[model samples]
Target: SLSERLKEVQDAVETAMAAAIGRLPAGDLRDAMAYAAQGGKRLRAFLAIESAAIHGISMAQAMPAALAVEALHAYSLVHDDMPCMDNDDLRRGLPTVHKKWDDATAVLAGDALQTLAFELCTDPVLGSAENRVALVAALAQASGAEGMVYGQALDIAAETAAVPLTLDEIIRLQAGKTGALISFAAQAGAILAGADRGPLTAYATALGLAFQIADDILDVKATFVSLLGLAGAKSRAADLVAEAEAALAPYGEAASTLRACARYVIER
Candidate 1:
């Protein structure tokens, strides 16, 4: 069920992002933006849609928020893969944006994607002005200095630091770098409804960490696996999934899809 849901979300996000990028003037800049924005698991977008559904928000109305989160994430990956950052040449089995179109194009495309994210949040289809403003402000906070950027800075610092990061240190860094956006995505629906976000926030906190821990396991990174040992990291991820599921108890059966997602985070 989650798989089908994810696929549906993927298609909607891809179509919306393509249409948005297509509206821009034809050129390498638009091409680069579309390239970078195409395809992923679409997990963040799914989170936004699912969370919105939980809050009784329609997919038609919530689509903009879903697009916003995915666009923001795409920009992060583009910039992250550049020479000054992760320096990877491949993303989603294709050349990274900078590799495909040079650094300048990558930079401009990423900037455009980031601005587009904010602009999408302002869509009147999302809800009232207050709700739109709340989404905009929350997105900024999640992606800005105290959130994703701070985590990224910590990671860069770690690579050059004389000593390896401890488990706590890695957790702290990832909570910002990766967890922050996930939290925002999962909470977007509640934000739109002006409903209490406590449960969604708690769920996102655990789910985000579990997601990153699973990532570390796949990359065989010293960040999490080395710090906790392989079995320990796996155990921790499972625990986090359980915690994430527990946080959704208030929603009862309505939260099944999200619970499935928590398990899928590690299983995938």
Candidate 2:
């Protein structure tokens, strides 16, 4: 099953990431890196690899790109955890980068990791110049001001505003904040697999919505119990998940793991 296969791939990627980071110098940077990198489900990486597999791309061909996605996600979390951002002290049950190290170190570590993501994308061993360029562009679009950063801005503004956001506004926020990178992950995989843009775009959009809906479900059901009342949030999440699943129906077996993972997200 795709669920089991994704878990195996995630574990392997986590092991490889741990060993790679372990080889780096031990210091504040390492601490920040480790804090940000560990404990994630590696869903982004898994999606990247699995999406490619659906198109017949070998795992070996997809790995470096998968790692690149993970690196970008880690780097974003490091900065997002800082006082200037979410002010989060814990992530994945560990002290956040800023909490584990000084603020300056945390900031710099994030900067370094962000660069590392691009480096991995462009690594000669990964793919050709054209593919690498496309990967980098996709990642940039996901993380830049036009996407997640803008979403964060909206989140920050919402906290101070008197009016509650409409459901469409909330959905747009989640699409940029959470869905952007997930979309990038799926699209990157399709690119690696040499898929046509038409089907790739369709699958990427479905997976993106699924990823965000799962996040919404998690926030309401478990993670953000305080923010949204359990019942209301759960209902909303279920609705979003249904919408996401419906969007995926066109892909059939080609999107099985992503579909199952989306469903698993709400079940949790």
Candidate 3:
């Protein structure tokens, strides 16, 4: 069951995002954009908006920031699905950008969206220059070569014919590749609203791990069942979720929505 308030928030954000993306130029680029944007939980945007609410900011005031996060997320998917990376043909249950459009168009669309994320954050309605700059920097650090890209290289290398990795190495890879952006999204919202750094950091860390755990569960249960036995992977996911929730204990009500959202991600 959806929490009424959270559901409302999610609906509002998704609707706004659809409207914004719909207004983009039509053709191959537009198709690629739609492929990148649609059919997900919109968890990153949700985190941004919810964190803003927790920090006493209005959703209307936070929409640009939230949309910026989503735009970056979408761009990442567009590139991540290329032949060089995940080589994924499907994203969010639709043909990936590269598969739906020509590789060149997909690349260009992704590049455009990445820049648009920063541009959107700079809009006067989003936040102050300081806040927007901080958000952009945080996102850049999380998404660029030093962060997700590096982690992805490791993932690809590990997938080689005879490579064996320890559990700790795998966790580190997952944390960097998948968790960094999520952490940034939550932290960006907190930073935008001028929240205390310590609590915000704690919440972001928990939310990030919980998100990865959910991914692990989904992969094992659906796509990677042969690689990670369903029961074993599910047990590990449950453990990670527990640790994630425990980490949220310090923030109390400030983290309630995030905690609930984490649970919903894994459970429903």
Candidate 4:
């Protein structure tokens, strides 16, 4: 059922995101922006919307916030694939922005996408002034130096370090680089519903780690995976999913979808 629910949210994100970026004044900039933003699992958007569902918030009301996370994620992926970072020529089975166009186009497109994300966060449709502000402030914190950026820096530093990083160090790094946004997306529902965010916070924290472990497992050469054998990594992810599911105990049946998502993190 979570698979079916994810498909529903996936369509919602694709349609809504295309329309939002489609309205941008036509030019190479908008072209590249939309191109980069198009298509993915839209997992971040689903996380926001599904979390909102748990809070009884309408999907229509959560669209702006949901799209905001997608926009931000797209920007990150665009920049991450550039020559400056991972230097990957492909993403989601297509030529990366840098590969499709040029480095300048990719950089500007990523910047525009990032700007659009904040604009969406400030959209009046999200809710009260308080709710919109919370989204904006939280997003800034998650994507900025205190979170994702800091994690990127650590990862880069580790790459050039004389000594291999300890496992604990890697955990802390991933917490910022990956966990921060995941936590924010999951918490958006609570902010919208004006409810306590602790449960979702706990859920996404473990989910984030599980998600990264899954990624590492898929990338056999990853330092994280090599640090622990395949069996060890898989076992760790299962443990994390268990923890994530446990964190949602207070929500009872309402948490089933998210718990299912946690399982899918490793199962996928």
Best by lDDT: 1
lDDT by residue for model 3 over 115-172, one digit each (tens)?
8788777877767888878877888888778777777777888777375776667667
Per-residue alpha-carbon lDDT of candidate 2 for residues 1-268, written as tens digits (9 for 90 to 100): 8567877887878876777667778987876776677767788888788777777777778887888889888988888888877899888777887887778988888887887778778766656788778888888998888887888788777767777777667667777887788788877766765556455455555556545555555643112333455676666566655665565566686766776766666677
Instruction: Give the worst 10-residue stretch by lDDT in candidate 2.
Output: 219-228
Better of 1 and 3 by lDDT: 1
Give the lowest summed-lDDT range of ten residues in model 3. Answer: 219-228
Q: Which 10-residue window of candidate 1 scores lowest in summed lDDT?
A: 220-229
Off by over 4 Å in 2: 22-26, 217-252
Give residue 31's lDDT in candidate 1 (0 to 100): 94
- TM for candidate 2 is 0.85
Clashing pairs in 4: none
Question: How does candidate 1 fare on TM-score?
Answer: 0.98
Error of 1 at 164 (Å): 0.4
* lDDT for each residue of candidate 1 in 1-268, tens digit (9 for 90 to 100): 9888889989888898899788889999999999999999899999999999998998999999999999999999999999999899998788999998999999999999999999999999999999999999999999999999899999888878888887788888999999999999999999999999999999999999999989988985247788888999999999999999999999999999999999999995
* lDDT for predicted candidate 1 compared with the true structure: 0.93
- Candidate 2 vs candidate 4: the lDDT winner is 4
**1-268 in candidate 4: lDDT tens per residue?**
9889889999989999999999999988888889988888877898899899999999999999999999999998888898878899989789999998899999999999989999998888788989888888989999999998899888878877888888889998999999999998999998888889899999999999999999988885236678778899999999999999999999999999999999998996
Ranking by TM-score: 1, 4, 3, 2
Q: How accurate locally, in lDDT, is each candidate?
A: 0.93, 0.73, 0.73, 0.90
Off by over 4 Å in 1: none
